[PDB]
Amino acid sequence: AKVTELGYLGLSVSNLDAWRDYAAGIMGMQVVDDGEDDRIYLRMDRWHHRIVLHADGSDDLAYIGWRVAGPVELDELAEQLKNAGIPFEVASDADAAERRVLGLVKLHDPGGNPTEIFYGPQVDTSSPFHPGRPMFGKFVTEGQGLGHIIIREDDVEEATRFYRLLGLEGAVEYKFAVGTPVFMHCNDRHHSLAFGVGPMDKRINHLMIEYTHLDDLGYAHDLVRQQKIDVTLQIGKHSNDEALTFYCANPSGWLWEPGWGSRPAPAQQEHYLRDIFGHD
Amino acid sequence: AKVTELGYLGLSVSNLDAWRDYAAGIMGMQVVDDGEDDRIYLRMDRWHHRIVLHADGSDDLAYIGWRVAGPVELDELAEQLKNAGIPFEVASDADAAERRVLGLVKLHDPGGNPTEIFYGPQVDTSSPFHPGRPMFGKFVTEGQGLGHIIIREDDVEEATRFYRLLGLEGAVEYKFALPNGAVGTPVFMHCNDRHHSLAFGVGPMDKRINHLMIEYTHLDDLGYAHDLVRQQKIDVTLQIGKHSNDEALTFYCANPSGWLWEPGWGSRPAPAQQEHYLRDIFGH
Amino acid sequence: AKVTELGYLGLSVSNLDAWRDYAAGIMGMQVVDDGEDDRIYLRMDRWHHRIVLHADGSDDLAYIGWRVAGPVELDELAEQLKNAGIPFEVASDADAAERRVLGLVKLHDPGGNPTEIFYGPQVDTSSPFHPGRPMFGKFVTEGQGLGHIIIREDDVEEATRFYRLLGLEGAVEYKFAVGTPVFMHCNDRHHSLAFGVGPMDKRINHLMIEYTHLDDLGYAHDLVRQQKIDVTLQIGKHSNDEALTFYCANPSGWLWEPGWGSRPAPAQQEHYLRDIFGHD
Amino acid sequence: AKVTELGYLGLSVSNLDAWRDYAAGIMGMQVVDDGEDDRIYLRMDRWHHRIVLHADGSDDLAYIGWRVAGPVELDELAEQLKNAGIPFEVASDADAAERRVLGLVKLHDPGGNPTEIFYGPQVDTSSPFHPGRPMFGKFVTEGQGLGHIIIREDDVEEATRFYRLLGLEGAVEYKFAVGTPVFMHCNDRHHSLAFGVGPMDKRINHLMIEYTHLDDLGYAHDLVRQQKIDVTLQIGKHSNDEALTFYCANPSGWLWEPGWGSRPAPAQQEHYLRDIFGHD
Amino acid sequence: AKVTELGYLGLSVSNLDAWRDYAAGIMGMQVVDDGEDDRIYLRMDRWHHRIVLHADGSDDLAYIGWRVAGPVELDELAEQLKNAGIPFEVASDADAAERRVLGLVKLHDPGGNPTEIFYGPQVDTSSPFHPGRPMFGKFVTEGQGLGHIIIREDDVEEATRFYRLLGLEGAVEYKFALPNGAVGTPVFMHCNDRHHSLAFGVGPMDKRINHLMIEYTHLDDLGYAHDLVRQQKIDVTLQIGKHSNDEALTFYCANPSGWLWEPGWGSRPAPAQQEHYLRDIFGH
Amino acid sequence: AKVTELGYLGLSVSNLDAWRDYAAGIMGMQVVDDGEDDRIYLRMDRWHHRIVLHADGSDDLAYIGWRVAGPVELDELAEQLKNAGIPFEVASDADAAERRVLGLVKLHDPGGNPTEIFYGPQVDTSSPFHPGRPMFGKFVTEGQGLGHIIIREDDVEEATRFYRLLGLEGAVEYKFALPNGAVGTPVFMHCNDRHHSLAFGVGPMDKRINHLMIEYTHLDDLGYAHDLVRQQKIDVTLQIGKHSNDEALTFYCANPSGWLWEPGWGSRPAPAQQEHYLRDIFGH
Amino acid sequence: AKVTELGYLGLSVSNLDAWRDYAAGIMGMQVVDDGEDDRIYLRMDRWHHRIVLHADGSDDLAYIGWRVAGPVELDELAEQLKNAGIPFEVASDADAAERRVLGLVKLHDPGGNPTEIFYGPQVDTSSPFHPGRPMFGKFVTEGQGLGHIIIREDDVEEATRFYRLLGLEGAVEYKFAVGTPVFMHCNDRHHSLAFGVGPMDKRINHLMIEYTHLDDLGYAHDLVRQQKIDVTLQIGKHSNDEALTFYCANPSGWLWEPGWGSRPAPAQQEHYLRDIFGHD
Ligand SMILES: [Fe+3]
Ligand SMILES: [Fe+3]
Ligand SMILES: [Fe+3]
Ligand SMILES: [Fe+3]
Ligand SMILES: [Fe+3]
Ligand SMILES: [Fe+3]
Ligand SMILES: [Fe+3]
């Protein structure tokens, strides 16, 4: 059994309203507020949500959810963890219900990042995704997860071995003291996960989200320029994912990377020395 | 040169608010309001609009706009009308501006229905379609027009001839027995892949327009619309069903102007060749 | 080895003639009467039959037949049952011949439902399916079974484990005391089997049958309206199978669900809270 | 490891010239005579030959050759035979060279039929197949073998178990004392092998060969009528292979079944009670 | 019979070396030098060339060459020009040789822009395209011509009519407010799959040509070009963006003659039918 | 209405036996002998034949047969010839029988080459093509004709005009320097998917025909033919190579009548539009 | 784990300039000179290089690199070697960096040929392949390796067993004392490797490189004729790969075989007695 996608992210945020303007108003996500006093959701497709916003007054990552196919696969994965010596917790039904999933395992990666493994997300088929701003197209999520994240690790090699155990595949992809970021995938998305990018003040460095239509990235690019917001990396392409993407600050003080046209991971490992173009 | 699609409809209404709730809130169209005194717009795709709503107090059809490919084609059609001795007005640039088109000709069909032929609709490709209720998919319009309409014609043969001149094709599609032994023979006509764009010969009518069909790309949006209408007790005069001709899955129901909208899914193209039916397939 | 489809159903019925009018006259199945004094068959495609009508004077389920690929797979499955502690019976040749199959294993599921596992159904290739009323198209059966059934179970978890052992895959699909129906598949049909829907007076709740052509469902819908028969659920869509279907009473006092446009099961487990539209 | 196709047949024949008129002159096979004093070959495609004609004065089967993918697969298959208790002989290089193959295992099936297992047939790529009469099209052989054969067995069940060990798959396909012919396949050809058809005077009952073009079967049908030769079964279709074929006597006193439009074997076992049409 | 593509451009330049560095060194074109005194060539595909560079001292457009399918088609177009009372020169074999074509007619458009119509370009299929900087892919030209241009026209309606005669199709593509309440209505026209080959009506211009669009098959080549231009501080007058009409991803920037090149990727075809816009999609 | 393909060739030969060995034994054609005194046939596909061999003592081309779709089309072409004042003979049913066709017209091209136009060739669909040496594949002929030929024309422009009337399309395909400063401009023409069916303007010729190209579906048959020719020392006057125009892989070599056959593989279609070359791609 | 392609070759050469004229000037490869004093590279596609030219004054093979998918596969392959008794060396990071790979295992085949196994080649995505002469098309390398090589072995059977252990598949393909060349593949390229061709003065007999466009082979054929260079085998086709190729001398005194239109290896082993055409 292997994880199949990056299913959801929990975020700790200090300012819900600013996140509404940003994620729905600019990025085109749908705000879902089910009445809960301490959280709201962000929806990108059929699923009830892909991202949870916990208004706990912090501004960092709360948890990463990795999907598996069903209860049998969840059990096989739990057993693999037990055999590897890795502490985990089979969540109760009520804890799974909090996450809007049927079954859920909670644990941590070797960098201390809260990591969850689940099957059976809540899908709202009867209430179509309705974007928070006008969209030409949709988001790329089908079988591919919500996007990709760079997260903090203190032991790159331990993290890699942990993530291969979960089912992800990958290796170092750039050589840039030579530093060696590692990139990993579990489906057709080039990667869902990367680490070893150097010292980081927060648990998460960025999140790349992907549009089906190029016109939606331009629409977002222009809203960000009009709203006169911080751009860290300009429009361009990495050698690895070969996607067209830009990097801007979110209300939590880290980066979102809205994108278009990401390719699949090569079936065999490669490594690069530099990006294709842009990203200035 | 011929008409290529049913491009837009002008509607006279007496209650804008009801229309907004109906067309956007249930059907999923986008309300476009340009700050005009007397009118708002309904949008279904990239075009600035497909339906104009003139808040004038009446509840009927105001005008029907038929698209042609371009200026040369508009000239060619104008000359054909003149050579048929059909009167028409060459609209100026301000009349074309008012309709959001590049050029147009204004006229009447034999039944007195105000009829426009235009090229160059306004398309808002910077502001994508944003439906007025959540939608699963979109509207079927590309190269097919807004949908199909049923309109009043006192002279069926005169209307048939008028619309063959414009470039529409078709003929009688159904035969049915009337009370006195007569035979009703409604005429259905198309100008593109859409089974038909136009019909008439369905008998006496108190308004110029009887119904409008609009088509969803996704059945679940038809399902959704149906559900809100049941939630809000609107008159579905004809239940879910298939006509023999268009072989579409549709339900008929009442709009705020007192006539019928027929939301539908899965319309088939107009056959290569003319055929007719005595009855429909199922439902309705 | 795994079961590949829901191959056949045996029904106990009190009124054969009424079943002829219903299943052939309305639904478009073919009545096959081979001279046997206590039964007649219903045929939907190439197979000799998909359903057996036993005129024993009862009005419920008699047996469920699950197909396997051949004698080797039947043996591997019998061995899996022996290893699990589940009593079974390898039918004799004459018992297999009664069912019109080459090899047959008889047993019961944990709810006490008679369950059969077979290979090699009788197929009448030289006598084409001829519908009991005029049909635009056909039934959807190829590699997909005859349709799907909701059956009674007293132990939802035991039933699930039993059915996974047989080769089916699935889980809970709706949360609606929270009740949790389970749905299962063994091929491209969304599901062949569901249970845990609540208390049931009979062994079987319904049977969904599927038309290739939409026009055939309308034809049946209209015959049911003309014959002024009981409709329990109106035309609509479940979130899970995303099929267009209606629910009406059969002469045995349970439901048939004639349908159109059922999709495959998602490759990974999901759960819903409500249907898409209709089914009032 | 499994056998992949029915690769070649060795025949013992009493009259080479009559076989030339028949197989090349009517059927459109190519006569290959490499100078050997006791044999000539029949070629149907790229291979040097598909059939060997041994002029030993007998009129029956000499051997059946089953192809495997290479030397590794040949070894795995030899090992499976050793483990099953089945005597075999690894042919020497010179014995393999006689057969025009690189590696060859000789043995017998439970009915005593000489059976060979080989890899690496001689292919004459530089000398295109040239038919013995004018042909519209070609023969169907690619990845499918030369055709199919009914052979004699005294123990139907032993033969089946032997043939499954070799890699073939199948079961009984007709019920017609009820007799139960077994049909087996190892590729896209409906079957390569059948037995249990009742008492037979010879080792082989027939050989079906298949044309790509319908017009070639008609051409052969007409030559057979003009030459006023024996027809046993008229043009028609079996329920199982669903091919269009006729049955005529060859100069050895058994049947050839020239054919067209044979379908693949169903992915799951079926059984019939009668043919579709024809074969009178 | 009609023009089929924008085949070549003749350019007057004052500095060959700068052009070589710009067109080849950055854009990826191949410099072709045939040992002529006064001119070199720029190549983008199998054709001997798409752009001629006459080192005469001026910095402007010299001529525009439009392709037709063959000799019969050239005759047919010649007769149409004559029947319209438009003057033209039938070039001799040496004039055709100079242009690397089999036949041609020379003339002027209403704005005085030297205009040629030809069949039979020279194609060097023994010496494949070899770009002047490493390229990921190639240029989009097949049956689409070199790209599209914006040129000076004092009389927009006269030019429109002139180019409909040649066989191009199109009309006004945008409307925008001018200072005095006027409406600018630029005309965009096509003769093949390329959205447009030609535009004008964009206002006063000091040179005959305003810009040229060239299209890469691969985005990474657009990316590459963009990067070298940033490395060499050339004026990108308009940043990465999409026009509503061609829906292409392009950036505008200055060439050594003082006007604009617009390298681009992913242009869409010209719609079956005329439509217009009030604004563009994004960027620029 | 136009010619659709080069249908057949009539050849005068002085040695049948050599031809049989060459055309069948090496090229893979089928010899068809109908028991006629004076002639045998060469077959390449379903047609009774593509080449007639008249054993009359001369070694040259006898006639060229061009196919049209049917009788109406033959009439239309006949009337076009008459309206051009080109003389022709309407063949009777026995003349059509002799050619194995349903109808035909007989005439001359400007260079005196006997020229026939026919519909309805005889097709032997009961006796499939059986090649005269083992073949891997077949000949390319469907809707493309037998191949292409080079023929003698004293007046290139007159011939061009003659063949545009018949319905062939094309123009000059190459330019090359002659000794005296002149320019040779051979004309290549097509009437279907085959790059060309016909060429001329290659200079002085002692026979009416210079070469014939035939095309194999499979390269291995080209390879096979090449090998037998090397085994039998026939003159391959031009080695394996690609022309710029047809972009085919072919080798030229001598037949028993003293002129050239060019067996080939992988010919490309004639481009949508006319283009020309100064040289060829490789080899030859 | 198996090797996936013939990734790179190291060559020892006496004359760098002559190799530049040959490989770039004629063949259309790109010369990459990164400043190193003892070597330059030849590039054929995205990779930094496919061939290394070591100017050590010798004129033969230096090493053969076989690609594997990643570090896990490299480990599984290293373990297979340890289990087989075959000495190997896990290269250090700096040794892998010298080769422009992320991980590297060094060893020898049974003929003494230096053999390397690596994952993660350096790819220069931001600097497109730019040919050393004008090219119509490109080289065929994607998932197929750089081409194929005939190398020297003293023990044909040992070499075969060694190469099957690495993941390659194959056997004897020609019978021509009967000699028996062996051909092997690990992807869609007919073969990457062949040996047993008879006595050889050098470690490598030839290298076949493949063009996507036929016109590029003709362009090279003509440059070789104009430069009036040695041709050993004329244009033609082998029965096995069915490619169109010619054989000419390189500045190191062995053969390059520029080619076009090579087919995949047959899924099952064959053997031939002669080539199709040409190669005189
Ligand atoms: Fe990223
Ligand atoms: Fe309607
Ligand atoms: Fe159901
Ligand atoms: Fe048979
Ligand atoms: Fe532009
Ligand atoms: Fe030629
Ligand atoms: Fe080779």
XYZ file of C-alpha atoms in Angstrom, chain G:
280
model
C 15.460 -3.830 -10.356
C 16.802 -3.708 -13.911
C 18.935 -1.364 -16.003
C 16.729 0.812 -18.219
C 19.073 2.095 -20.908
C 22.579 2.396 -22.267
C 23.151 5.825 -20.690
C 26.706 6.877 -21.593
C 30.072 5.771 -23.025
C 33.539 6.895 -22.036
C 36.024 6.784 -24.884
C 39.852 7.000 -24.789
C 40.962 9.007 -27.837
C 44.266 10.256 -29.237
C 42.965 13.154 -31.325
C 40.271 15.477 -29.880
C 40.178 17.913 -32.856
C 39.572 15.098 -35.384
C 36.798 13.771 -33.128
C 35.247 17.278 -33.114
C 35.172 17.385 -36.926
C 33.780 13.869 -37.035
C 31.175 13.730 -34.239
C 29.946 17.331 -34.367
C 30.890 18.318 -37.916
C 29.500 15.214 -39.590
C 27.260 13.327 -37.148
C 25.663 16.505 -35.722
C 26.525 15.984 -32.058
C 27.161 19.007 -29.824
C 30.663 19.583 -28.433
C 30.582 20.436 -24.765
C 33.823 21.717 -23.299
C 33.479 22.649 -19.608
C 37.150 23.631 -19.164
C 38.526 20.274 -17.968
C 42.066 19.723 -19.255
C 41.814 15.996 -20.102
C 38.329 15.593 -21.626
C 35.459 17.018 -23.621
C 31.901 15.752 -24.050
C 29.535 14.885 -26.825
C 25.881 15.743 -26.361
C 22.949 14.256 -28.319
C 19.875 15.447 -26.360
C 18.744 16.978 -22.998
C 21.504 15.242 -21.048
C 24.664 17.162 -20.348
C 26.395 14.469 -22.502
C 25.990 10.906 -23.781
C 29.667 10.387 -24.549
C 32.891 11.412 -22.804
C 36.112 11.852 -24.791
C 39.161 11.265 -22.669
C 42.256 12.468 -24.354
C 44.578 9.906 -22.782
C 46.265 9.051 -26.055
C 44.585 5.639 -26.406
C 41.929 4.723 -28.982
C 39.382 2.359 -27.415
C 36.557 2.045 -24.884
C 37.015 3.507 -21.404
C 33.636 2.617 -19.792
C 29.958 1.721 -20.407
C 27.253 3.370 -18.218
C 23.877 1.647 -17.653
C 21.062 3.741 -16.151
C 18.742 2.608 -13.373
C 15.627 4.427 -12.171
C 16.866 5.763 -8.803
C 18.815 5.072 -5.565
C 16.475 2.253 -4.437
C 16.963 0.395 -7.736
C 20.716 1.004 -7.573
C 20.745 -0.632 -4.139
C 18.651 -3.626 -5.231
C 21.028 -4.079 -8.175
C 24.130 -3.791 -5.947
C 22.598 -6.435 -3.678
C 21.965 -8.778 -6.650
C 25.664 -8.423 -7.588
C 26.802 -9.144 -4.029
C 24.596 -12.277 -4.040
C 26.086 -13.418 -7.371
C 29.690 -13.097 -6.160
C 30.493 -10.247 -8.541
C 32.953 -7.667 -7.155
C 31.761 -4.069 -7.319
C 32.494 -0.654 -5.903
C 29.949 1.915 -4.707
C 31.527 5.120 -6.056
C 31.911 8.070 -3.700
C 29.898 11.256 -4.240
C 32.924 12.910 -5.921
C 33.275 9.981 -8.341
C 29.568 10.189 -9.163
C 30.009 13.982 -9.639
C 32.865 13.363 -12.103
C 30.400 11.286 -14.191
C 27.604 13.924 -13.745
C 25.345 11.423 -11.944
C 23.906 11.246 -8.431
C 24.824 7.630 -7.627
C 27.222 5.257 -9.342
C 28.414 1.670 -9.069
C 31.643 0.630 -10.853
C 32.480 -2.951 -11.922
C 33.590 -5.108 -14.859
C 31.794 -7.580 -17.070
C 33.261 -11.137 -17.555
C 35.165 -9.910 -20.632
C 36.926 -7.279 -18.504
C 35.001 -4.319 -19.930
C 34.597 -1.487 -17.408
C 30.879 -1.303 -16.636
C 29.083 1.339 -14.571
C 25.576 1.430 -13.136
C 24.095 4.793 -12.256
C 20.995 6.788 -11.528
C 20.247 10.506 -11.941
C 22.163 11.886 -14.984
C 22.825 15.599 -15.263
C 20.256 17.117 -17.610
C 20.691 20.619 -19.035
C 17.077 21.633 -19.556
C 17.853 25.352 -19.734
C 20.371 24.988 -22.582
C 18.780 23.246 -25.587
C 20.731 20.745 -27.667
C 22.424 22.669 -30.482
C 23.831 20.388 -33.245
C 27.425 20.638 -34.520
C 26.103 20.736 -38.060
C 22.617 21.617 -39.368
C 20.052 18.941 -38.571
C 16.580 18.309 -39.966
C 15.533 16.435 -36.817
C 17.078 14.979 -33.675
C 18.572 11.776 -32.274
C 16.512 8.881 -30.965
C 17.262 8.651 -27.320
C 14.157 9.031 -25.260
C 13.930 6.066 -22.970
C 16.073 4.209 -25.505
C 19.647 5.119 -24.569
C 22.302 6.612 -26.844
C 22.335 3.637 -29.267
C 23.913 0.190 -29.398
C 27.345 -1.337 -29.183
C 29.096 -4.520 -30.072
C 31.708 -5.279 -27.426
C 34.385 -7.964 -26.982
C 33.812 -11.023 -24.792
C 35.946 -14.177 -24.411
C 33.129 -16.112 -22.709
C 29.847 -15.583 -24.546
C 27.806 -17.646 -22.054
C 29.291 -15.942 -18.956
C 28.631 -12.516 -20.526
C 25.009 -13.418 -21.268
C 24.390 -14.599 -17.668
C 26.070 -11.426 -16.368
C 23.939 -9.221 -18.600
C 20.656 -10.978 -17.688
C 21.535 -10.385 -14.059
C 21.757 -6.651 -14.841
C 18.277 -6.835 -16.318
C 18.910 -7.129 -20.040
C 17.065 -9.770 -22.072
C 18.170 -11.604 -25.137
C 19.758 -14.558 -26.864
C 21.480 -15.628 -30.006
C 19.963 -14.005 -33.076
C 22.071 -15.273 -36.011
C 23.663 -18.571 -36.933
C 26.455 -17.779 -39.406
C 32.488 -23.507 -36.928
C 29.000 -22.032 -36.537
C 29.281 -18.611 -34.846
C 26.443 -17.275 -32.697
C 26.235 -13.533 -31.929
C 24.047 -12.638 -28.955
C 21.822 -9.518 -28.931
C 20.295 -7.876 -25.858
C 17.795 -5.137 -24.910
C 16.418 -3.366 -21.825
C 13.876 -1.026 -23.460
C 12.180 -0.263 -26.823
C 15.502 -0.062 -28.733
C 15.918 -3.358 -30.626
C 19.112 -3.953 -28.775
C 21.526 -1.874 -26.730
C 24.174 -4.543 -26.614
C 25.650 -7.319 -28.731
C 28.646 -9.702 -28.514
C 30.103 -13.000 -29.780
C 30.852 -11.670 -33.255
C 34.341 -13.243 -33.384
C 37.891 -12.063 -32.560
C 38.275 -8.306 -32.105
C 41.414 -6.181 -31.778
C 39.609 -3.560 -29.632
C 37.056 -3.601 -26.765
C 34.316 -2.034 -28.917
C 33.488 -2.954 -32.554
C 30.921 -0.302 -33.329
C 28.339 2.146 -32.092
C 25.034 2.649 -33.830
C 23.427 6.076 -33.416
C 19.958 6.788 -34.677
C 18.334 9.786 -36.322
C 14.622 10.616 -36.093
C 14.691 11.977 -39.658
C 15.854 10.021 -42.710
C 17.177 13.235 -44.240
C 19.803 13.494 -41.475
C 21.294 10.108 -42.399
C 21.543 11.166 -46.037
C 23.135 14.455 -44.968
C 25.746 12.488 -43.019
C 26.176 9.942 -45.831
C 27.039 12.768 -48.220
C 29.457 14.551 -45.869
C 31.307 11.204 -45.475
C 31.495 10.846 -49.270
C 32.663 14.438 -49.790
C 35.243 14.080 -47.004
C 36.127 10.849 -48.882
C 36.176 8.674 -45.744
C 36.222 4.887 -45.244
C 32.947 2.979 -45.707
C 33.002 -0.677 -44.582
C 29.317 -1.601 -44.921
C 26.997 0.137 -47.424
C 23.419 1.292 -46.809
C 21.169 -1.634 -45.847
C 19.123 -3.578 -43.280
C 19.890 -6.312 -40.749
C 17.143 -8.932 -40.346
C 16.978 -8.275 -36.598
C 16.707 -4.510 -35.924
C 15.310 -3.861 -39.452
C 17.006 -0.427 -39.403
C 18.432 1.523 -42.351
C 22.125 2.103 -41.506
C 25.666 2.512 -42.904
C 29.087 1.717 -41.338
C 32.048 4.135 -41.410
C 35.435 4.535 -39.681
C 35.837 7.028 -36.843
C 39.085 8.853 -35.915
C 39.789 6.086 -33.339
C 39.975 3.383 -36.021
C 36.660 1.632 -35.256
C 33.160 1.924 -36.695
C 30.201 4.171 -36.241
C 26.900 3.016 -37.729
C 24.649 6.051 -38.365
C 21.071 4.835 -38.751
C 17.349 5.430 -39.220
C 14.111 3.553 -38.521
C 15.183 0.868 -36.042
C 12.221 -1.248 -34.801
C 11.574 -2.639 -31.315
C 12.884 -6.077 -30.335
C 10.361 -8.882 -30.937
C 8.576 -9.773 -27.672
C 9.713 -13.353 -28.262
C 13.148 -14.605 -29.397
C 13.872 -15.278 -33.090
C 16.982 -16.194 -35.089
C 17.997 -15.397 -38.670
C 20.561 -16.806 -41.119
C 21.237 -13.565 -43.069
C 20.446 -9.814 -43.379
C 17.561 -8.345 -45.436
C 19.424 -6.211 -48.017
C 22.547 -4.073 -48.542
C 25.500 -3.947 -46.131
C 27.996 -4.822 -48.919
